Amino acid sequence: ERLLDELTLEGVARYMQSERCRRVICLVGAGISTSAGIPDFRSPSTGLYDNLEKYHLPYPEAIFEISYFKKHPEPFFALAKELYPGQFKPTICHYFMRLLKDKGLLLRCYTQNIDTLERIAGLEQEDLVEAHGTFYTSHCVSASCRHEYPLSWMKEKIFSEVTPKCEDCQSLVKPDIVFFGESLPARFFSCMQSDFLKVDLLLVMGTSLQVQPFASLISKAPLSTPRLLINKEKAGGGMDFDSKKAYRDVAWLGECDQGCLALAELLGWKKELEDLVRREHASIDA
Amino acid sequence: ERLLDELTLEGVARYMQSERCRRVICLVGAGISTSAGIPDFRSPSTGLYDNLEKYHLPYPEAIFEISYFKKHPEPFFALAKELYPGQFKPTICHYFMRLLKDKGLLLRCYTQNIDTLERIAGLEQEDLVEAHGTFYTSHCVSASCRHEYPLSWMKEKIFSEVTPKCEDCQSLVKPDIVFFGESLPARFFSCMQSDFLKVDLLLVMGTSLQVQPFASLISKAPLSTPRLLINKEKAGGGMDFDSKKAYRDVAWLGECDQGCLALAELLGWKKELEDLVRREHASIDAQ
Amino acid sequence: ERLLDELTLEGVARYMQSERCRRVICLVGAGISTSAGIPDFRSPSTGLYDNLEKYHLPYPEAIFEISYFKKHPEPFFALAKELYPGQFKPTICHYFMRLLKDKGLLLRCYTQNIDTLERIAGLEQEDLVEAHGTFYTSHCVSASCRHEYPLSWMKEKIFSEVTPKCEDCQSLVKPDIVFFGESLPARFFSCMQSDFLKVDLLLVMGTSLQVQPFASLISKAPLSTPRLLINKEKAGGGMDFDSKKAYRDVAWLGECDQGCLALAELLGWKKELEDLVRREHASIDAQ
Amino acid sequence: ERLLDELTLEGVARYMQSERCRRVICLVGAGISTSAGIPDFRSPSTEAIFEISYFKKHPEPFFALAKELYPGQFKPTICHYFMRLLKDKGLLLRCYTQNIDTLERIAGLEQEDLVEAHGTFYTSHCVSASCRHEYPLSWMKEKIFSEVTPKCEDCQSLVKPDIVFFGESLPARFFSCMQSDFLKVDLLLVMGTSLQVQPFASLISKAPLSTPRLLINKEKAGGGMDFDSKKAYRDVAWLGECDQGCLALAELLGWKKELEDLVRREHASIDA
Ligand SMILES: CCCCCCCCCCCCCC(=O)O[C@@H]1[C@H](O)[C@@H](COP(=O)(O)OP(=O)(O)OC[C@H]2O[C@@H](n3cnc4c(N)ncnc43)[C@H](O)[C@@H]2O)O[C@@H]1O
Ligand SMILES: CCCCCCCCCCCCCC(=O)O[C@@H]1[C@H](O)[C@@H](COP(=O)(O)OP(=O)(O)OC[C@H]2O[C@@H](n3cnc4c(N)ncnc43)[C@H](O)[C@@H]2O)O[C@@H]1O
Ligand SMILES: CCCCCCCCCCCCCC(=O)O[C@@H]1[C@H](O)[C@@H](COP(=O)(O)OP(=O)(O)OC[C@H]2O[C@@H](n3cnc4c(N)ncnc43)[C@H](O)[C@@H]2O)O[C@@H]1O
Ligand SMILES: [Zn+2]
Ligand SMILES: [Zn+2]
Ligand SMILES: [Zn+2]
Ligand SMILES: [Zn+2]
């Protein structure tokens, strides 16, 4: 019945090495990019939502709300200036997903992040569902124009403190983040309907799973599919680590980078991971 | 529209005297502690990175990487023995920041240094973002223990050439430095998100700004905010001293202590600064 | 005549949410800082005035009287040693006023306290009438000198049990408290004459309203202005909570922190308030 | 003028034997109870759940934790009974305690001897201000172990143990004692505390500059004490076990046998 021999990281690692673990889905969020210097959303003191006071919003969520944006874009672009990283360097956790890809294990990475770090780690477009879009490209908001602008144009406007206006039609230009009030990307719908029918392992990292419909994804997997959480805290998506009925869900509590190193060590991959991280970090820094 | 009347130290000092200049942020590195007997990292011949061959490292950065530390901690602690100062005596530069604090000008000092000298100079923790942590406290590496050990305990282990181990759990004890591979302190995150919205002056001292995310901090300030560099050389993080579009950045090239004395002179603080330094140095010497 | 739909905290909260209430004045005393470890003045056994025997004063008030201070400063500084707080950590009540500022509802906080916790909570100089002055700054008492000294300087003197003397003239150095016999701050008179004519709500917290002229402020608002008292006991004057003629005054009897938490909950601000308190308290606790 | 002849336990004992040392204040924390099998709650190996407004809405988590953390027995240490002997010899002005484990009361310190800084688990009170009914340790325990949320037998409001929850005021006795105790204290005895948490940590700096201060603790306390510098004149650190420090001090005062006898008989009485 139970696919894992025990509900521990060691059990997960032994299952990953067995013949039946062939397709892996990663589900990630802002916690996997904190060690790259990008704050998460909900951590006390450090998270974005604990640092919005000086933007004098009518309510905290307005700064990521499409209707507020169209009326008052200034706070969002001020925030962009304060958070824009100035180097885009993926974490150990990101490179662990790259190893999954290189060893033919990665079916998909579902990400709530907009930082583009999955791509920089070497995950290709087909490997990814960018459920919140991306900062990488920007567009005029007018549906009858939709002129595209690259990262270098948008960055220029952000750091010069000029509100991005479209060069054709003078409408606001917005990064391709899915703001509150905008539709999810088509790839979310297309990929979610097939990926979870036949997946052997879910790896949930650096997310509190507080936002639908992303949170519901883990429940779509087969009943027998083991699920591993690598996170600072127990997240709020129907995982059962503790009950008498617990049979497939494992939590490793701590930093995403440490958890990925620990899992890599059990798999015999730790040296390869650390070499990959060193080489890519060295390259990005040069 | 340009907040400085000219791109000189005199210009910065006059701006600093004006009503508009109320909140100053200092951003500092290892250059401000070389006159306190601690080498910087990147200066040719004298800096730490030109003096690592004898430690027989796989690559230079290994000695400050958490993963290498956990495996082979000996080189780090042998290095700690060679660099640990005989006394902790802040510089003129550190006491200049103390003056900024006492005159109600200092919003924050962001430091890359681990030497605790900002604190010894009388900057309180509230005034500081210790971006690389501190040597002042140490901790057991085990997440399920984290037994705290003071400077005096860590110092004794270093000079007796015994690798620091936990008294409770026998795992490695590490100084609270942020090694390569470790997360930045929480306070960097929280302060970084508010301090740079409303800042009137940046003072960048004794740093080459080669390392992210610290280097990006100066670009978070308003476009209008004047920025003064006091450093031996131009820093390698988006400042524009020399181009035809230069409007707000000023470089004073030389020793940090000398620049701070020059600025203090222009502000009418030189005698007060010199008297504070003399007093505090005598007091520390007397211990 | 009746701007509140009922004389309850819930009525006050619905009035505050409406368009009718745009300008709030807070009037605060020592009760808002008891949970921050500073005693109040009048409470039996626990209050400051019940604990003055050991200072062998000619009479209770002498310790806060300018003329007695100049002749015998020592009891004041020994008292300052005993009450000086371990940290300056504002209470939930302080941060509730911070919320009033951030939502554009705070016309003014009038404070009788000298503990500086309104400032530390993030209320700016412009939001405040510091009616009793402040411990934050100190001055030489001599009119022809008036050298200013910072809190750190004053603390050092307090804990070393050396009476503060000015470095220039050797006159006594006094914290900027408005001692008895001293003129009231200019801001008290100027703000009163424009604030109380357009106030929509008075929030009276942690004060017995026993001392004049501060107590009289509550009668300066228009007769239609609702007034909420959040205090352990009914304040001893002018306010009518209980008679058949009662129409605008509401008492919430209990701890200021708990009263403010209750009011915030009714307003839909509980989480916003608690998040703010938590992040500010965590920051201060890490010094 | 240094009140100690030397900065050692022996110097402290000789000071304690002089007519000058009449009034002792003990400042204690979790380190004094770890020998009684009570866990140091701040130790990482060994916040709504302690907040008053959350408790009134969701009390179950607190009482589930109370069931788990409830000690097998309340059995004070050699250290606690050293304080009992200080009381019995007329030396104890006050014990200021950070612990809620009640071991001071069981050791025979009376409420008049005590300032419980974070309150006490010994008594419980109904949350209604218009009722405020008191309940003993024995009643609260029965509620905790039956896994029924305790309600008041008169008004059906929540009954809460007298721990000072977050968002509650400091106790009255903190204010009334703190304002007089430290002006006339002759010796501070700080035991089993790191002195990192405020406002408790600041209590030691309220004593006069001349007042000797003895630290009995495993480590140096991390709030403004000077054992080592060439200016050191009054602070003494005895490093090791609180029980062993107290035995060694008792021995120098000629109290060791009395202390041992008290400990043994009380331990026996409690076990029975
Ligand atoms: C290139 C950057 C440019 C800057 C421009 C700014 C644009 C900001 C992006 C707008 C995003 C759209 C609006 C929005 O608010 O989306 C949010 C977000 O997409 C969604 C999901 O949130 P999420 O990704 O789950 O992030 P949370 O902050 O809610 O949770 C993170 C979790 O991880 C943990 N954690 C933290 N750090 C670590 C670590 N190092 N190791 C292990 N775990 C870690 C935390 O304990 C926590 O459980 O909820 C929110 O609608
Ligand atoms: C307290 C006991 C000490 C012994 C312990 C030794 C352990 C060392 C711990 C190292 C921390 C690990 C990670 C690490 O390597 O951090 C480094 C560092 O924190 C970061 C930033 O580097 P930084 O602080 O900018 O230091 P640099 O050496 O790169 O730059 C110093 C700059 O200043 C200039 N300069 C020099 N002297 C003067 C002077 N007197 N006046 C004016 N300018 C001066 C130089 O010309 C140069 O531009 O880059 C590196 O990751
Ligand atoms: C920062 C360093 C501090 C140490 C320095 C020491 C110097 C401080 C003395 C400054 C000199 C000022 C002279 C002076 O005596 O001013 C006094 C004072 O400013 C003025 C006004 O008195 P007040 O602020 O109204 O203080 P009271 O004690 O008269 O009344 C406090 C009220 O609050 C209540 N209460 C208590 N706790 C709570 C609580 N937690 N929740 C709710 N309510 C609470 C009490 O029940 C009481 O009704 O009358 C007096 O001249
Ligand atoms: Zn367009
Ligand atoms: Zn340990
Ligand atoms: Zn003077
Ligand atoms: Zn009751």
Residues C257, C92 contacting (CB under 8 angstroms) = yes
The Cα–Cα gap between A34 and A113 comes to 11
Interface of C with A (CB under 8 A): 102, 275-276, 278-279, 282-283
Cα–Cα nearest to B152, from D221, D6, D214, C287: D221
Helices (H), chain C: 9-17, 66-71, 74-83, 92-102, 117-120, 151-159, 186-195, 256-267, 270-285
Residues of B in contact with D220 (CB under 8 A): 150, 152
Is there a cis peptide before residue D199, judged by omega within 30 degrees of 0? Answer: yes
Give which of A231, A230, A276 is closest to A98, Cα–Cα: A276
Resolution number, Å: 1.9
**Which chain B positions have a beta carbon within 8 Å of A278's beta carbon?**
59
d(CA B80, CA B2): 46
- Please name every residue paired with D25 in a beta bridge, in sequence order, or none if there are none: D94, D188
Q: How was this structure determined?
A: X-ray
Across the interface, whether the CB atoms of C152 and B122 are under 8 A apart is answered yes
Three-state SS string over C148-199 comes to EEEHHHHHHHHHCCCCCECCCCCCEEEEEECCECCCCCHHHHHHHHHHCCCC
If DSSP states are collapsed to H, E and C, what string results for chain A? Answer: CCCCCCCCHHHHHHHHHCCCCCCEEEEECHHHCHHHCCCCCCCCCCCHHHCCHHHCCCCHHHHHEHHHHHHCCHHHHHHHHHHCCCCCCCCHHHHHHHHHHHCCCEEEEEECCCCCHHHHCCCCHHHEEECCEEEEEEEECCCCCCCEEEHHHHHHHHHCCCCCECCCCCCEEEEEECCECCCCCHHHHHHHHHHCCCCCEEEEECCCCCCCCHHHHHHHCCCCCCEEEEECCCCCCCCCCCCCCCCCEEEEECCHHHHHHHHHHHHCCHHHHHHHHHHHHHHHHC
In DSSP terms, D188 is beta-bridged to D25, D213
CB-CB under 8 Å, B145 with D45: yes
* Contact: D180, C254; criterion CB under 8 Å: no
Task: Return the biggest CA–CA distance within chain B.
Answer: 62
Separation CA A29–CA A208 (nearest Å): 8
Enter the tokens of residue D106.
Answer: 């069981």
Q: Quick check: B38 and B83 in contact, CB under 8 A?
A: yes
Please name the residue of chain D whose CA is at the shortest distance from the CA of residue C160: D209
Q: How many CA atoms lie within 13 A of D237 on its CB side?
A: 17
Separation between Cα atoms, residue A110 and residue A195, nearest integer Å = 10
| Least Cα separation, residue A240 to chain B (angstroms) | 23
Torsion of CA B99, B105, B107, B113, to 10 degrees: -30
Q: For the CA atoms of chain B, what is the radius of gyration?
A: 20
In Å, how far are D60, D86, D101, D258 from D265, measured between CA atoms?
38, 18, 21, 11
Task: Return d(Cα C165, Cα C173) in angstroms, integer.
Answer: 5
Report which protein residue has its CA nearest ligand 3's atom 18. Answer: C112
Q: CA-based angle D176:D177:D178, to the nearest 5? A: 100
3-state secondary structure of B125: helix
Query: How many residues can be counted in chain D?
Result: 272
Contact call for residues B232 and B255 (beta carbons, < 8 A): yes
Number of H helices, E strands in chain B: 9, 9
**CA–CA distance from A73 to each of A142, A171, A269 (Å)?**
15, 11, 46
Q: Spell out which residues line ligand 2, taking CB within 6 angstroms.
A: B 29-31, 34-35, 40-43, 47, 64, 79-80, 83-84, 112, 114-115, 132, 135, 177, 206-208, 210-211, 231-233, 255-256
Residues 6+ away with beta carbon under 8 Å from C254: C230, C232, D129
Helix (H) or strand (E) holding B148: strand B148-150
Local structure of C250: helix, strand or coil:
strand
Residues of C within 8 A of A56 (CB-CB) are 102
Chains that touch A (3 or more CB pairs under 8 A): B, C
Q: Within 10 A of C183 (CB to CB), how many other CB atoms are there?
A: 7
- C143 CA distance to ligand 6 middle (Å): 8
Rounded to whole angstroms, the Cα distance separating A218 from C228 reads 50
Q: Which of A72, A94, A132, A281 is catalytic?
A: A132
Question: Chain D: which residues have CB within 8 Å of chain C?
Answer: 47, 52-53, 129, 167-170, 172, 175-176, 178-180, 182-184, 198-202, 205-206, 208-209, 223
Nearest Cα residue to B174 out of B191, B158, B185: B158
What would the two tokens of residue B186 be? 């929480």
Report whether D4 contacts D234 (CB < 8 A): yes
Please give the structure tokens belonging to residue B191: 């302060």
C279, C283, C287 member nearest B124 (Cβ): C287
Beta partners for residue B231, in sequence order: B253
- Gaps in chain C after residue (C–N beyond 2.5 Å): 236
Distances in whole angstroms, Cα of residue A41 to Cα of each of A25, A44, B43, D237: 23, 9, 39, 46
- How far apart are the CA of A131 and the nearest CA of chain B, in angstroms? 25
Q: Which of B42, B76, B82, B83 to mutate to test the pocket of ligand 2 (most atoms within 8 A of CB)?
A: B42
Tell me if domain D1-34+77-117+172-272 and domain D35-76+118-171 are identical in fold: no
> How many angstroms separate the alpha carbon of residue D151 from the centre of ligand 7?
8
Q: Least CB-CB distance to B144: which of D45, D228, D231?
A: D45
Question: What is d(CA B144, CA B125) in angstroms, rounded to the nearest whole number?
Answer: 27
- CA-wise closest residue to D260 among D241, D242, D246: D246
Spans of all domains in chain D: 1-34+77-117+172-272, 35-76+118-171
Which residues, 6+ apart, have CB-to-CB distance to B192 below 8 Å? A82, B129, B213, B217, B220
Instruction: Compute the nearest-CA separation of B43 from chain C (Å).
Output: 34
Look up residue B185 and give its DSSP letter. P
Cβ–Cβ gap B190/C283 under 8 Å: yes
The CA distance from B30 to B36, in Å, is 10
Question: Among the atoms of ligand 3, which is closest to the Cα of residue C254?
Answer: 42
Phi, psi (rounded to 5 degrees) for D210: -75, -15
Give the residue among A270, A242, A247, A256 at the shortest CA–CA distance from A111: A256
CB burial string B53-91: b at 16+ within 10 A, e below: eebebeeebbbbbbbbbeeebebbbebbeeeeeeebbbb
**Residue A158 near ligand 1, beta carbon < 6 Å:** no
The total of other beta-carbon atoms located within 10 Å of residue A170's CB is 11
Q: Which residue has a Cα nearest atom 25 of ligand 1? A: A207
CA–CA distances in Å: residue D102 to residues C254, C285, D38: 27, 26, 11
Of these residues, B56, B72, B94, B132, which one is catalytic? B132
Sequence positions preceding breaks in chain A, C–N over 2.5 Å: 236
Cis bond before residue C213 (omega within 30° of 0):
yes
Place of tokens 């009668």: C219
**Distance (Å, rounded) from C-alpha D111 to C-alpha C33?**
26
C259 Cβ closer than 6 Å to some ligand 3 atom: no
Alpha-carbon span A183 to D30, nearest angstrom = 55
Residue with tokens 């005393």: C29
First to last CA, chain C: 49
Question: Is the CB of C82 less than 8 angstroms away from the CB of D170?
Answer: no
Closest C-alpha among C229, C225, C241 to residue C2: C225
Is B144–D230 a contact, with Cβ atoms under 8 angstroms apart?
no
- Is residue C113 marked as binding? yes
CA atoms of C29 and C20, how far apart (whole Å): 27
The span from the CA of D176 to the CA of D183, in Å, is 13
Distance CA C27, CA A172 (A): 45
Distance CA A83, CA A68 (A): 20
Distance from CA of C240 to the nearest CA of A (A): 36
Residue D197, number of CB atoms within 10 A of its CB: 16
**Closest among A185, A149, A208, A281 to A30, alpha carbons compared:** A208
CA-closest residue to ligand 2 atom 1: B115
Q: Count chain A–chain B contacts defined by CB atoms under 8 A.
A: 57
User: Which distant-in-sequence residues (6+ apart) come within 8 Å of A231 by Cβ?
Assistant: A31, A204, A205, A206, A207, A208, A251, A252, A253, A256
Residue D152 annotated as lining a ligand binding site: yes
Which spans in chain B are helix H? 9-17, 66-71, 74-83, 92-102, 117-120, 151-159, 186-195, 256-267, 270-285
The number of residues in chain A equals 286
- Spell out the residues 6+ positions from residue D230 whose beta carbon is closer than 8 angstroms to its own: B286, B287
Does the Cβ of C208 fall within 6 Å of ligand 3? yes
Q: Could you tell me the distance, in angstroms and rounded to a whole number, from the CA of residue B166 to the centre of ligand 5?
A: 5
Treating both helix axes as pointing N-terminal to C-terminal, what angle do A9-17 and A256-267 enclose, rounded to 10 degrees? Answer: 50
Helix (H, G, I), strand (E, B) or coil at C261: helix
What architecture does CATH give domain D35-76+118-171? Answer: 2-Layer Sandwich (3.30)
3-state secondary structure chain D: CCCCCCCCHHHHHHHHHCCCCCCEEEEECHHHCHHHCCCCCCCCCCCHHHEHHHHHHCCHHHHHHHHHHCCCCCCCCHHHHHHHHHHHCCCEEEEEECCCCCHHHHCCCCHHHEEECCEEEEEEEECCCCCCCEECHHHHHHHHHCCCCCECCCCCCEEEEEECCECCCCCHHHHHHHHHHCCCCCEEEEECCCCCCCCHHHHHHHCCCCCCEEEEECCCCCCCCCCCCCCCCCEEEEECCHHHHHHHHHHHCCCHHHHHHHHHHHHHHHHC
User: What span, in angstroms and rounded, lies between the C-alpha atoms of A81 and B199?
Assistant: 14
Cα→Cα distances C278→A64, A204, D48, D267, Å: 24, 28, 11, 42
Cβ <8 Å between C161 and D198: no
The terminus-to-terminus CA distance of chain A in angstroms comes to 51
Q: How far apart are CA C141 and CA C177, in angstroms?
A: 12
Strand duo A128-130 + A106-111: pairing: parallel
Q: Phi and psi for B128 in degrees, rounded to 5?
A: -120, 145
Q: How far apart are CA C24 and CA C12, in angstroms?
A: 12
Give A150's strand partners. Answer: A137
The CATH number that domain B1-34+91-131+186-287 falls under is 3.40.50.1220
B45 C-beta neighbours (distance < 10 Å), count: 7
- What is the best residue among A33, A232, A253, A261 to mutate for testing ligand 1's pocket, by most ligand atoms within 8 Å of CB? A232
Count how many residues are written for chain C.
287
Can you name the CATH fold of C35-90+132-185? SIR2/SIRT2 'Small Domain' (3.30.1600)
What are the residues whose beta carbons fall under 8 Å from the beta carbon of B194, sequence distance 6 or more? A51, A53, A54
**CA D35 vs CA A68, D75, D80, D90, D248: distances in Å:** 60, 10, 11, 26, 16
Nearest CA-CA partner of D59 in D175, D152, D198: D152
Place of tokens 């002129």: A147
Determine whether the interchain pair B125/C287 forms a contact, defined as Cβ–Cβ distance below 8 Å: yes
Q: Which residues pair with C27 in a beta bridge?
A: C110, C204
CB C110 within 8 A of CB C132: no
Q: Is B139 helix (H, G, I), strand (E, B) or coil?
A: strand
DSSP assigned state of C46: T
Q: Which helix (H) or strand (E) holds B105?
A: none
CATH architecture for segment(s) D1-34+77-117+172-272:
3-Layer(aba) Sandwich (3.40)
Q: Which CATH number among 3.40.190.10, 2.160.10.10, 3.40.50.1220, 3.40.50.2300 corresponds to the domain A1-34+91-131+186-286?
A: 3.40.50.1220
